[PDB]
Design an enzyme around this catalytic site. Sequence first.
Site, PDB file in Angstrom:
ATOM      1  N   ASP A 108     -54.637  15.554   5.673  1.00  0.00           N
ATOM      2  CA  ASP A 108     -55.902  15.288   4.973  1.00  0.00           C
ATOM      3  C   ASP A 108     -55.983  13.787   4.703  1.00  0.00           C
ATOM      4  OD1 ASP A 108     -58.213  16.806   3.551  1.00  0.00           O
ATOM      5  OD2 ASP A 108     -57.462  15.346   2.096  1.00  0.00           O
ATOM      6  N   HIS A 278     -57.097  24.747   6.541  1.00  0.00           N
ATOM      7  CA  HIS A 278     -56.858  23.317   6.462  1.00  0.00           C
ATOM      8  C   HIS A 278     -55.447  23.004   5.992  1.00  0.00           C
ATOM      9  CE1 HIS A 278     -57.919  19.110   5.902  1.00  0.00           C
ATOM     10  NE2 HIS A 278     -57.525  19.171   4.643  1.00  0.00           N
TER      11      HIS A 278
END
Lengths: 298, 300
Positions: A108, A278
């Site tokens: 991320d 994610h």
Amino acid sequence: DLADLFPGFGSEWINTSSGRIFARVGGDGPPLLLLHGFPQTHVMWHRVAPKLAERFKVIVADLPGYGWSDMPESDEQHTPYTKRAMAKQLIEAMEQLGHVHFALAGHDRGARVSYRLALDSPGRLSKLAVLDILPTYEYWQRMNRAYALKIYHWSFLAQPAPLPENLLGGDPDFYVKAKLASWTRAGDLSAFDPRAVEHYRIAFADPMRRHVMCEDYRAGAYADFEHDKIDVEAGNKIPVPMLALWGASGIAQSAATPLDVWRKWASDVQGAPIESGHFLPEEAPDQTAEALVRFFSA
Amino acid sequence: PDLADLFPGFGSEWINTSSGRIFARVGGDGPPLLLLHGFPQTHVMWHRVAPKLAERFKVIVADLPGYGWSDMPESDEQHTPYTKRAMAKQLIEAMEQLGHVHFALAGHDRGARVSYRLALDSPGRLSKLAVLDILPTYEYWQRMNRAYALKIYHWSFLAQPAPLPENLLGGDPDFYVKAKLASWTRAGDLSAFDPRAVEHYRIAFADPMRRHVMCEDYRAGAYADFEHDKIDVEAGNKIPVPMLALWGASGIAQSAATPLDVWRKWASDVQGAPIESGHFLPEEAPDQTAEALVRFFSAA
């Protein structure tokens, strides 16, 4: 009352010119810096770092401004929360440990620091792994209706202060839990260790921490994009061998085919999807740890 | 918490419709002219231009469905009641309750989305249409890029599934409505607004049910509204009603536009005029907005 999710890992507060980096440190071998993203802290690595620690000197750092790292005071260009500045500060942090050449895995925001680090200071990196991202430039360049809805937070958290801060301040627990849950394969919090969630929630409960994340996203909308823009329009590719990993139901794969995109940014990239949302290292710890160990090992 | 009557002389009408009541201030006489507010406002945003329109028209200053004091129809999974198509059909019914089956229509922001959708769906209902500081919803989304996503972030933010936007708006509703009002003006503060008008906006925005409706609006705006607009683009359907497109020089239309150039793709007969104003034309530049509206509508 925050749990120690890295049993036997050391604790380092690394002084840099831009403030202390907190990091868990464990293992032995070549240095591997692990960088988390939003809305998390270094503890997101707690399921994969121990497997990495049998092979590498694993450094699990909070990003500048995140977790227990110091928060440099931002400015109108959000400079210390640009990935360029964050990369430089982490380079400094690693140099304080005697690590001037290291492996890097980022997730991320930390993956955004990572590939920016690889562009700005490729000589610092042995190998690079980025987890469930495309370059910031690519997100903005693919920001059509579908994707603007999908990652609205990229535009929302980039709104001028204090607008996201003020909305986030009413019920920060809700938002951090919402973003954790929404980006998982399952769409709830089952993938996460409840003790990890508490770390994320507690970090998010601090209004200064939340401001840092917005500054991170403001940097992401502005300077970070501009820095990426320069590189891609200059044809500047990451020369460091890199692994692009992404969740099949993650964010990177929503904008485009991640490996195609990364091949435009990196001359030596390999890619692999992992069945995960994610949060690859918590939703798919064994598969993520295996992919990272394999790629960083010889 | 008492408000302010910002339409002296105007009556107050709760117009019954099959989806709920439409609140409207009604004044003047002559040809009917419906005035539609947008977000995050109520009908009172017209308080500085409606008197001047009331010189020549029966001015109906209506709260949009779900907005202000209009009733809030229950939404559904498709946000159907707050799609512009359903809002236009509800206002058509409202206008029919007054005997107005052929009216002029000026819309701002969401109300202008209602208004051009009304003109696409039921063009025979309108003598003339004026939209203030919008492009069609299809255009905003088709132009969605980094620059637009940042400037109209709320199009994607408020369109998030419930209760994300509602819970965040709840975090500081007073701030948010005032920030929207100020950030879209030329000045960047609340100085263009009558503080009595701002209080109307703040009190409506203070209600979570009202904020929910507004998100339902933007959810429609991201989905059904866009689809409806898409059908017209792809079918070449143009607005045949005489159109005026007003926009602020510093408003939410000029950016990726030349709005008249965009609107000409959407309407066969559209005139356009930039107004020295931010987004809130009727309050930032009332005399200029009123003059342009009066000049355009005066005929019938």
